[PDB]
Each structure stands twice: as structure tokens, then as C-alpha cells.
Symmetry: C3
Subunit: 523 residues, 3 copies
């Protein structure tokens, strides 16, 4: 018997599977704390923007053309290139394949066929077929592909690896890579492809350079683009409006009151007119200008130009120094030699105490590093037990991860029906007496699908697959498992009742007021 799940928005019912072992991540002791010695108090003030080196892989759309022969053996084969041109120009595919000849079931027509959407396809690998039989079929998949720097090869979402640079345009093999078979690669200038293969009549679109590669079981096509125009090696991390900077003999140390991180760099600057900054220069400059306009246009003035620094940790810093206007000007905006001396003394007092404040703020900012390093070690230790929760806490977004020894694998989640989730009432393992499930078993259905699947209920509405988590049936038992807006009581590994979530208090770490439980009476 069953009981029925309840929807939720940010954490939908989903099955998260590991990306074939490819998206690996690991913890490293990369937090280094260096306490600044001098108590020097003439610190500079300014606006700062921080960019991080882009490690994420460039993602681009590819097309995968195949024909399917069934006798359930399901042989996949490459369509001929003329048939590929038919598919790209007319969105139609011919009803035969020849190697000696085969046709759709009980047919000989070699007629043209109109491609139609496969409704079983997803937001990745959107698929089109000529015969909707979800014999011979013709199939076109449009899907993602990822390539990490250096872009000398790319891996498509279907797991095929191609040893060709996604930016090799047939005239730059000296600045790119090509490692696949030469006789099976074809670049086409001004190639015309239809907008949607599933439409009987679609708006044709011309693409500058389209590349094709004849795989063994497939033909893979992708649109060649300009590297410097589509890929940027720096990703904007964060802008700090109130930044202070202390100068050493060969170091600039940047601190921010709102940030728990301090940056350290050499006093030599980066050439701002360098090509590696081309995709972030204007953005960073305008970000600095915006922060000035909205915050310091009236009370401050720009001191120097924009200076680019490279942090010891690898970050890139764009710096705009700011200096507050004199107190005479500030007062005039808010509204004789002896009066000039009075204002000079006021300015000296103000500057001295402001430098004291800035030194104190810099020390406060430096005070966070040891705590951050120790919490990093805490995260590394806890990631062996629940890597998904730890990485979600670190990155402040729902992240699924799996433990792989000394590394973690990132996983991608497929949203399921959300209304087919049926939780089983009996958590006792009937197939093995003495063993009980750790979390309740769920019946669920994938989208646009009807085959009932059996998984196990996880946390945050996640559905688990594979080997079910089991344990010893330690009677008496009383467990409460939450899914959606609902809680399920299991007494002695059998479903008892529903529980209102309002009947369960939430831990408040900020306030931390506790309620006394019911007393016991030596019973």
C-alpha cells in the first residue's frame, strides 16, 4: 500500500545521477593566512571588483544524426552526407539506408519523410524522429557539448569524445587542434540549417561555418565560432564599494568590511590593455563607474586611474582609489588665515582618526582567516558523509554530489512527474527478515513515461536509486520522514500516520530559545 507525496517548488522531486565520473571536484587546503605586521595607518580607500579564473567548460550546441535498425538489437548507423544535407535543408529524411538495402517495416518506397518531435525528449538531447514508434528509423538529436581550456577536444552530453577544437575553422590548425580522422571531417561555409527539425515548414538560417564529423554510429555537427568572442577566461566574482588597502614594501593588501576574505598582491600592476582582459575590461570599468556614480559622486573624488592587480591566490582585481573631499567642501555641500588654520587642524584630526578606524577595520577583516580555514577543514571532513549538503551550503545553491574516495563527483538531477510519487507503508525488507530500510521506498514515474520505477525517498524531495539503504530492525522504532509539505510517521517500520509540519518546531540558531520537554517519572 501507498501514500501520496506533495509538491514543492525549489526542491522538486528529482533523481540525481553522477555525470559518468567526469565532473570531479575535491577539497584542498587552499586558504592561507598571512598576518600583516605593521600598524601603519595611512591606508588607501577605494572601490574594488574581483574576477576569478574561469574553470567552467565552454558549452555549445551540437547535432547528432543517426539511423536505427531493429531486427531489439538496435544498431545505430551514420546517415549519408547527402541525407544530412536533406535533413538540414528540408527538415526531411529519406526512408531507406544502404550499405544491402533496408526500409521501414514492409515497405520499399524510399520516399521522403517529415521529421517530427520526439515528445520523450528533454531540455537536453531534444530529439526528432521520422517514425514515432517509441524496422528502420531516422533520428536527429540536438544536445549540449562541453570543452575545457585548452579547447582541444570536447565531450558531448551523450558521452562521445571528439578530438577536435570547437573553434577549428579550417584555417587555424596552428592555433587549434584536430585529431580525428581527416577523411571524415567537413567544414561548410554559409551552411543553411532549419530552425526546428520538427516543423513541416521552418525559417531557414545561414551559419558562417558549420563542421561535420562522420562517427562510426553517428554524424556530429557543430557551428564553429570565434574563441575570443565566445569564451572568457575570467568570471566576475564580487564588487566591494568600501574597500581599504594597506601598502607594504612589495605588497598591496585589500580588505572589505562586508567580506570575510582579504586579498594580497604585489605592487606591480597588470597591463590593463592586455588581450586576456578584453572580455572583462569594459564590464569591470563600468561596474566601477556605476559604484562611483551611485555612491561617491558627491562626497568623494577619484584618486588615480583604474589599476589592475593579480592576487597571490590568482584573482584579478580592478581598483579605483577614492579620496573624500575636504571638510570645507563637505560642509558647503551640506549647507581668514586663522580660519584656514582652524580648518587645517580639523582636517588633520579627522584624517588621523579616520586612519585609526581604517587600521582597525583591516585588522577585523584579517581576523576571519583562521576561522575560515578551520571551517574549510570541517567542510572537508563532513563532505565524506553528505557531500551534496556541504557543497550546497558552500555554494548557496542546490548541489548534488557523490563520494568517490578522495574526490567528489557532481551529479545532475532529472525532474520526475512530481505527482506519481507513492511512498510505501512497510519499511521492513520482506526479501530479507531482520533487515529494514533506512528511508521509505517510493514508487515514481519519469516524465512522459508510464513504467513504474522503485526508488528510495531522500532528503529535499530527492529520489534515490541503486542499492537501497538498509539497517538492523532495532525495535521499538519511531521515525518521521519529510517529503514536500508533509511528514510520515513509521512505527516499528510500518506507516502510522501523517504529521502536521506545524507540530514540529524548527531549530533557531540565531535566537536559541529552548522549550522544556515532558518530564519523566521513573517508569
Amino acid at each position: 500500500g501507498d501514500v501520496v507525496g506533495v509538491n514543492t517548488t525549489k526542491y522538486p522531486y528529482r533523481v540525481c545521477s553522477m555525470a559518468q565520473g567526469l565532473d570531479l571536484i575535491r577539497f584542498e587546503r587552499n586558504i592561507v593566512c598571512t598576518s600583516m605586521k605593521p600598524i601603519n595607518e595611512d591606508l588607501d580607500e577605494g572601490i574594488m571588483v574581483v574576477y576569478k579564473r574561469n574553470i567552467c567548460a565552454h558549452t555549445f550546441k551540437v547535432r547528432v544524426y543517426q539511423k536505427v535498425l531493429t531486427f531489439s538489437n538496435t544498431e545505430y548507423v551514420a546517415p549519408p552526407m547527402w541525407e544530412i544535407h536533406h535533413i538540414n535543408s528540408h527538415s526531411q529524411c529519406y526512408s531507406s539506408y544502404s550499405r544491402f538495402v533496408a526500409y521501414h517495416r514492409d515497405s520499399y518506397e524510399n520516399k521522403t519523410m517529415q521529421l517530427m518531435p520526439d515528445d520523450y525528449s528533454n531540455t537536453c538531447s531534444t530529439r526528432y524522429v521520422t517514425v514515432k514508434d517509441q524496422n528502420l528509423n531516422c533520428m536527429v538529436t540536438i544536445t549540449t557539448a562541453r570543452s575545457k581550456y585548452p579547447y582541444h577536444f570536447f565531450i558531448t552530453s551523450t558521452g562521445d569524445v571528439v578530438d577536435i577544437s570547437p573553434f577549428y575553422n579550417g584555417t587555424n590548425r596552428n592555433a587549434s587542434y584536430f585529431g580525428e580522422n581527416a577523411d571524415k571531417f567537413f567544414i561548410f561555409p554559409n551552411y543553411t540549417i532549419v530552425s526546428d527539425f520538427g516543423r513541416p515548414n521552418s525559417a531557414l538560417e545561414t551559419h558562417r561555418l558549420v563542421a561535420f564529423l562522420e562517427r562510426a554510429d553517428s554524424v556530429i555537427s557543430w557551428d564553429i565560432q570565434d574563441e575570443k568572442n565566445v569564451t572568457c577566461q575570467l568570471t566576475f566574482w564580487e564588487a566591494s564599494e568600501r574597500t581599504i588597502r594597506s601598502e607594504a614594501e612589495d605588497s598591496y593588501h585589500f580588505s572589505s568590511a562586508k567580506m570575510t576574505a582579504t586579498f594580497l598582491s604585489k605592487k606591480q600592476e597588470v597591463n590593463m590593455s592586455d588581450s586576456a582582459l578584453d572580455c572583462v575590461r569594459d564590464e569591470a570599468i563600468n561596474k566601477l563607474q556605476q559604484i562611483f556614480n551611485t555612491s561617491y559622486n558627491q562626497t568623494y573624488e577619484k584618486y588615480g586611474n583604474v589599476s589592475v592587480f593579480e592576487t597571490t591566490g590568482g584573482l584579478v582585481v580592478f581598483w579605483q582609489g577614492i579620496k573624500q573631499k575636504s571638510l570645507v567642501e563637505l560642509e558647503r555641500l551640506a549647507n581668514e588665515s586663522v580660519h584656514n588654520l582652524v580648518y587645517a587642524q580639523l582636517q588633520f584630526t579627522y584624517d588621523t582618526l579616520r586612519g585609526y578606524i581604517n587600521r582597525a577595520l583591516a585588522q577585523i577583516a584579517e581576523a576571519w582567516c583562521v576561522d575560515q580555514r578551520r571551517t574549510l577543514e570541517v567542510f572537508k571532513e563532513l563532505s565524506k558523509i553528505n557531500p551534496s549538503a556541504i557543497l550546497s551550503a558552500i555554494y548557496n545553491k542546490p548541489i548534488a554530489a557523490r563520494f568517490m574516495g578522495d574526490v567528489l563527483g557532481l551529479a545532475s538531477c532529472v525532474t520526475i512527474n512530481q505527482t506519481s510519487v507513492k511512498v510505501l507503508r512497510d519499511m521492513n525488507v520482506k526479501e530479507s527478515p531482520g533487515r529494514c530500510y533506512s528511508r521509505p521506498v517510493v514508487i515514481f514515474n519519469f516524465a512522459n513515461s508510464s513504467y513504474v520505477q522503485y526508488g528510495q525517498l531522500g532528503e529535499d524531495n530527492e529520489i534515490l536509486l541503486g542499492n537501497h539503504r538498509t539497517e538492523e530492525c532495532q525495535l521499538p522504532s519511531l521515525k518521521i520522514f519529510i517529503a514536500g509539505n508533509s511528514a510520515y510517521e513509521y512505527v516499528d517500520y510500518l506507516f502510522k500516520r501523517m504529521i502536521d509540519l506545524s507540530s514540529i518546531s524548527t531549530v533557531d540558531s540565531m535566537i536559541a530559545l529552548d522549550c522544556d520537554p515532558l518530564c519523566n517519572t521513573d517508569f
Copy 2:
């Protein structure tokens, strides 16, 4: 064989049992961080007091009248209401029960009997019996009962649930609830009850309205009181003396230097003359006044009246703005137009730099939120392994909790003899070779009791019951277990000796100075 435990004050030897699954608690991602954008520096200063919504259940005393028939079947039955009046007025009970008639062993007297204390009873369920035989007996238990808002039903410590509002006084069923059998409920104006049932002659006391309900096996009585007079939905959390507040277009943001939490509310205020604030208004007002008198009466002045705000997180804030007296007044307390201008310039400089300081403090206070959120996730992950330790760390008090899947159950601890704790010498499981106990087995005795109980030694002098924790006998073994002021060495799962606690160093996280261990010599 045995070895003897040693006392300790804050963590007495105790057995902690879960409150029947009723006192549930869970972790939720309830820490939300919203970084304030503007660097506006005209922040307000003031005193703040913060109250939290009262989630704890209202607790009130009830009386449970029963008679006990033994033939060990121990049938419990409801005493007749006239016998209830005898018990309440004379503290005496009649020696018979009729349904056809029964008496104390080998008796027919139907004599009156004087109630005497049951010394086996505790600080909860204090109990009185007529025959001290720890046959027919007469018994009166006085015990706690809890009711959560809305007070439409209450659960007594003995686990009986009653569907009657603890504040239904027989004339307000429109503003209360009554769901029990009507024929079995009786309210009595000006009911006279004795102070102590165990005293031969006690001081009688009149109670305005006393309610009785005839259960199947019991009669339950409670004193009806005024809701608004006995229940308060707001609990005082904390007062901040140095509070700063930044004003947005539709937000007030409160920060405190001593607090790691910042509050955010709309600029619309709460009506301070609202009935829901009646039980906290005067207290909060006097708290604000006290903080002013002891801290700001001389150097500051009150700016505005007391403003009540409702925080986005549900807290209630009482705010008193304060403004420091002019520097001329401060100097005069510490002790012409051109001199007025000089003092105006001094005041302008002071105000500008003070606003800078306040903005920096607000940013520092906001810097804690991400760290607090990540530590909340750390606590949630660690609470699956040791919920009691994690909740004790969060609430800064000894808390016992049990893991119940996606929730935690709060547990209540019964203090045991404290001198009957005998630790067994052999941690090897004799009943199953190859298995060994994880922690040493303890013989202990409950208070006022003699039946020896067998449990397992826990941490912080806790005694564990139920299924003993076991593991594989991984020889060689060397474990040291601490109870009281003493440490027990177990070598190869057999007790070796005592260990002086002074011979074991304590980890110092603040100082963190380490001592090198004895070197090894490739042996």
C-alpha cells in the same frame, strides 16, 4: 566485577528517555542573508529589545484520581464523584469501591482512610496512596499537563489526551473548545481543595473554578484560569544597548556590535496599544528605560518615542532612539559667533566621522550571516550523529535528543541514585563471542529503589538503556572512558586501571599550542 563511579554536579548520572515522540524538533534553512546595497551613512542609534514568538506549550498542574484493583492485573477505575469531594475536602478516601463491591484485603469496613505520601513519587507525578503497599487501593496523582496554542486540548504528563481547552470556564465555549463527553464534565465554582493530600490536617484553599472530567480509568481535575492572564505569546530574547539602524525606502535594518544577527523589518510600525503586546509591553518599556538610566541618562537624550516593529523573521522589536548631546554640552558636563561657528564645525566633523564608523559597524555586523548559515548546515549534518551534543552547543544548556529520521526528539532525564553506578570490568560480550561493547556496561539503581538495572555508560555521566552499542573486537585495544572525575582504562576490552584526569591534556582552541609526542624508532 565492578568499579565505582564518582559524582558530578551539572551533569549528574541520569537516564534520558524520549518523550513518547511528542517533543519533536527539526533543522530548517531559516537563515536568510540580504546584503544592504546603499552606503548611506546617516544611521540612527538607539536601544533595542527583541522578543520571540512563544512556541513552548503552556504547562499547568492537574490531579488524577484513581482506584486500583489487584487480583497483578492492576485494573484502574474512576472513583465516584462524592469520593472525589471527600478526597478534596478531607484529604481522605473511602475503603470501598462498588460497580458488585470490593474492599481492602480481607475486610468489609468501608471505613475512611487517610491519604499519605507515596515516597516513590518524583518532582513530577507526586503521588498519594491510602495503603502503602508498593486487594484495593486509592490513589491521587498531582502532575503536569501541556497545551500548545491554540489551547483546544492538553496532554498530561501521563500521556492522556483531553479534548478540552484549559481555559474553558463554562461560559466561553464560543472562544474556547470542548470536545469531550458532556455528561462527564463538571465545573465547580469556589471549589475547596486541601493544600497537601498527604497531611492529616492541611490548610484548605478555595479555587475560583475547578473542572473535573470522568475518564474511563480516572478522574482528571484542573484549575481553570484566565488565558490572557496566564499565557504570553512573546518571550523576551535579548536587549541590545548599542544598536544602529539603517533606513531604506521600505525597510529598517537593525544591527548590534555584540550580536552576530541583524534584523530587517518594514518601516510601518506595530500598534503598541495592541492586545497581543499586553503581557510584554510594560516589561519591554521598563527594560528600555533601565538601559537608558544606567547608560545614556547623562551623555544622550531620547529621540522620539518607543517604536514597535515586526521583523521579517517574526521577531518583535521595541526601539528607543537615542541622540548624543552636542559636544558643547558634553564638554560642559566633563568640565561669540566665531566660537559658535568653531563648535558647529567641530560637531560637523564629529558627526561625519561617527556616521562613517556606524556604517563600518553595520557592514561588520552583516558579515556574519553567511558564516552563520554555513554553520547551521554543519549543525544539521552533525545532528544525525549526535543530536544531543549539537543541540546542547546551540542552546548552551544540557539537552538530550534522539534521531528520528528527518526530525529530532527531545528527551527528559531522570537522575539516578548517583552512588549505585558500578562499571563492569569486562567489555567483551560474553553472550556472543567476537562482539564487544563500544562503551562499558554499568549497574545502577533508580532513586528510592533497589532493583539493580543494567545499562551502558554514556558521555557526560549519562546512562544509556535499550540495545547496547556493540562492535567488532579489534584486538589489540586500548580505550579510556571518563565518568565523573575519573577515567577507566580498558586494554583488550578488559579493565586495566584508573587514570588521573590531570595526566590527560585538554585541547585549547583559543591558544592552540601543541606538545610533541614520543618519537618512534622503526620498530
Copy 3:
């Protein structure tokens, strides 16, 4: 089959073994938070140095003289005292032992023999033998010994315990201890010992008082030194240059912006001319003077003398108050009655706002205590799973520890060959089907040794010994284990390939930018 490890500097391949259960450590709730109530703003400023009570054991070199009889029974015996004098004066040992008489194999010479280094010996227990046969042999070990306060006994690295004070010089048994057999103890004034026993001719050195004790199987010798001259009960923890101090009615509270810890003491001072401060007085004084010279010689002046305080937590504080020079002097260094009044008003304004800043800084410093206490509880909970990692994070140095119930044992690591580390390809337990290793098995060799040892690969290049960690073979499997600069893929518990470390991203907690994994397609 095997695959070959790769070197690393800070974490060399090593085997870490627990120091016989002697170097115990435990977590205790020793962080106490006391929030200061008054908002009083006339805080003192000064330089502070903090020393901690020395808990580490005094370590001193000892010599262990033995003769070895083999018939593999390997009886160890004490050399006669005249032979001990021969060893100490000539670095030579006689070729016989008598109790009736024995000689080197097939010999009768009773000739003198020259001691030569045993190359199998380490940086601890450096060893010298007369016959290099790694029968009768003569052996001299030079090794460490530890004694904790009170120094009434010491334990040598070979584990022998001696009930004699390392500072008993034969004339101070009233201020020391002697508990070993009186007839077997001999102190020798101006004893001459050679610098190196392994050298044919070495530079003789005279030692004031050398003590010998005739053990059953050994003779143990050590050089008696002056306690007060070799042992210091206070260890320097840390110096704070910018320290603020708030005065209560019976308390001084010290805070530092760069520190997350605040200190609290009574206002009564420690006598700086006390003998217990003799080994830290000059150092602390000069440290204070250095901080003044390099930071405050120009802008500040010393206020009062050096005051020594004892913190409630047991720390020792040396305090130098500093007061900034008047603004007139500061301005003159940077470069009538009415002008004196103007400068007095400027100074009053500056002092008022500076006191406000100092009060805010003190509150900020106090804000860390609850977070530190909660993180201490987090560390205590996590140390049961991985004590070495937690203690390494706390002390910021590579520390190996073992779990021992309610305590942790510190362990010492022996560096191995570093080039003999061979990782096995098959992680499946051949001796028991259905069980698999948790981490890959390693073949390794100890230094100067050839017997191949079988251990298990740990983290940070650690080699594990004893019972191998095992688990269920949960196929399919894909694990990646890192050693040196290399990563090993194991698919289905069989070695697959090497993995470039650059292909694995590192978690960045400070920046926290995430890359999306490859999407899934309902497969």
C-alpha cells in the same frame, strides 16, 4: 601488479604509530563567554604579550648500555660499570660478559672492540654496536626521555620508566625525588664522555654531574642539569600590538582586533619579581620594548610601567599601556589662549570619538566567543571520526591522532623510503569474496631496510597499518585515490588509469563559484 607513488615535501610517505597510550589529549568545554555589561568608553590602549602554562614534558637525552646474548632468544643484560667507564672514556667495549663466561662466536680473546654506528638507527635511539651483524654483542643507544612536572620520574623513548627526578643531583633529595634502588644509582662529578661513540677517536667532553642507574637489562645514564636553568613553566603564545582594555570594579578585560579571543583578569597584579617569571621576564619585556620601538616610538608615549596579570583562564599577560601624544605634538611632527582652547576642543572631540571606536572594537571582539564555543563542540564531535584532521586544523600543523574512547592519543610518524611505495591494482579482498578494501593496498619499505611491508594507503601520503579497512563490494564502483601529485582511478575495485590532478577542480570556499555538470536525459 603495482603502480608507483610520487614524492611530496610537507606530507612525506610515513607510518604514524600511537605513543603506547601515553600522549593522551581530550576535548573539554573550556570556552566560557562572559558578556561585559557597561558601555563605559574610557578604555585603555596598550601592548600585550600572552604566555601559556607549559604543559609539555621536559625532554633530555639519555644513554642506554646493554649487552645482547643470542643462542633468537636475545637476552639483554647490563654491562658492568667498569665496562661502562671504558665505553664512556675510550668509546670501546670489551669482548666478553661474565655472570659463567661468554664471548663472540667461536672466540676467547676478551679483546677490546671499537664501537661503530648502527646504520639502522634513526634520529631517535641512535645506536652503536661492536659487531655489525644486523653470539654476544655490545650496544649503546642514545635516545630521548620525557618528564612532566613535577619532574619526579621520567619515561625514556624505549618505554622504560625510572622513578628518579632528572634534576636530583645527590644533594637535593628534599627538593627532588629518588625512588629507585639506592644500591644501583651512582652520580659522578666531572664525568668525561666522548662526543661520538662511533668514532675511533673523538673529542672528549666533561659533564658536571652524570647519573647512572643499573636496570635489570640495561644501564641508563643521563646528565643532571639545573631545573630552573633548563625548564620554563610558561610558553610564549602571542603578542598583540593594538590591545584595548576595559576596567570594571574588579576586572580588567583585554581585547585585540586581530584576535578572536578576549582575556579577563582581576585588577590585582602579579609580582613581576617572582621566581616563576624568571625564564620569561626579560623576553617579555624586550618583546614589549620592541613593539614600542617599531610601532609607537614617535606617535605614542608609555603610560605606566609593565603590569603582569593572571587571566581567569590561566594565561599570563604582560601589559604596557600606551597613550597617543596630543594632537598639537602629532601635527608638529607631521609638519594664544583662544588657540589653546581650540586645540583643547579638538582634543576633546578626538578623544570622545576614539573612545566610541574603542568601545565598538571591544564589542566586536566579544562577539566571537559564542561562535568559537560552538565550533569547539563541532570539533569535538568530528574528532571521533577523524581526530588527526581535526587536531591538524586546530593546531595548524600535521598532527596524527587516534581515537581512544573519550580521549585521543597523539601519534608519531616514521618516514619510509618514499620510493618503495607500490599501490596494488586490485582492491578486492581475494581472501574473502564479497568484501573489498576501502582504500588501496600499498607495498612499502622502511628506510635502510629491505623486508617488503604491506599496508593501506591513507590520506596526505600516510601509510596505514594493522587491520585493513574493508566494506561491501557495492558494484558498480568508481573511486579516485590521491597520493603524491597523482590520482588513481579504480573501477569495480580494479585499477583503471591515472588521472591528472589538473582535471579535478578544487573547492573554493572564499569565492564559491560553481560550474554546472553535464545534464542528464532520462536514461
